[PDB]
Amino acid sequence: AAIDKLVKASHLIDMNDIIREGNPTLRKVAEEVTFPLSEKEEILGEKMMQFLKHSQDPIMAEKLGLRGGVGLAAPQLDISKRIIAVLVPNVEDAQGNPPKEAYSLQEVMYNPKVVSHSVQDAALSDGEGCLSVDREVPGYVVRHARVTIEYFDKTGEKHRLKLKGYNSIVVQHEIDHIDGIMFYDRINEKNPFAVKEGLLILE
Ligand SMILES: [Zn+2]
Ligand SMILES: [Zn+2]
Ligand SMILES: [Zn+2]
Ligand SMILES: [Zn+2]
Ligand SMILES: [Zn+2]
Ligand SMILES: [Zn+2]
Ligand SMILES: [Zn+2]
Ligand SMILES: [Zn+2]
Ligand SMILES: [Zn+2]
Numbered sequence: 001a002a003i004d005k006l007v008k009a010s011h012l013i014d015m016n017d018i019i020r021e022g023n024p025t026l027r028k029v030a031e032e033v034t035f036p037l038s039e040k041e042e043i044l045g046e047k048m049m050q051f052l053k054h055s056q057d058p059i060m061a062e063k064l065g066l067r068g069g070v071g072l073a074a075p076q077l078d079i080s081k082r083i084i085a086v087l088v089p090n091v092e093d094a095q096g097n098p099p100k101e102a103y104s105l106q107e108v109m110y111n112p113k114v115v116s117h118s119v120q121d122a123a124l125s126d127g128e129g130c131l132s133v134d135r136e137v138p139g140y141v142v143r144h145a146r147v148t149i150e151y152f153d154k155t156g157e158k159h160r161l162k163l164k165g166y167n168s169i170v171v172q173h174e175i176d177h178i179d180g181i182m183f184y185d186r187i188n189e190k191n192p193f194a195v196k197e198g199l200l201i202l203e
């Protein structure tokens with residue numbers, strides 16, 4: 001099964017593990033995981049996180065043929081479980097100094113969900129992309145500006161977290177994957193760049 005390939009100790013997730021647009025697994029609602037985690041579900045989370053680290057490392061991205069990435073959902077690896085990893089980096093300053101925090105968000109989330117959100121909407125000004133999508137998809141992907149999520153980590157400990165800015169956009173994108181929603185489902189059907197008043201455009 002997919003999961004058996006993925007969790008072999010020597011296996012590194014790369015682009016050949018990523019299923020594509022059209023594969024029915026991207027359109028399912030993923031199955032809740034139960035605690036304590038199997039060995040597999042735990043190893044799967046570490047691999048997914050390892051993949052995002054690799055994709056942001058100039059050397060490993062080049063060794064593995066990996067495109068830069070900040071989130072990955074298990075549906076994208078053909079695994080219908082409610083498991084996402086998020087790794088959102090902070091940026092150096094004009095002087096070249098690393099940030100205090102390497103990441104604004106670094107987490108493997110089991111059973112994540114949006115429990116509440118803002119009336120206000122937000123969109124990345126640059127559109128969104130997807131590891132599974134090999135097309136140029138222009139337009140504003142309309143999301144919530146702010147969300148409160150709950151989720152479990154690999155110990156089964158429950159977290160309640162509020163997010164805004166880019167972290168919020170990233171997490172919504174990944175949660176959508178475990179619900180069978182693709183980014184272009186939240187792009188206006190007639191005008192991709194339609195701005196409804198009040199929309200927070202993130203630069
Ligand atoms: Zn592989
Ligand atoms: Zn069930
Ligand atoms: Zn472990
Ligand atoms: Zn490594
Ligand atoms: Zn929502
Ligand atoms: Zn709502
Ligand atoms: Zn995606
Ligand atoms: Zn609750
Ligand atoms: Zn459409």
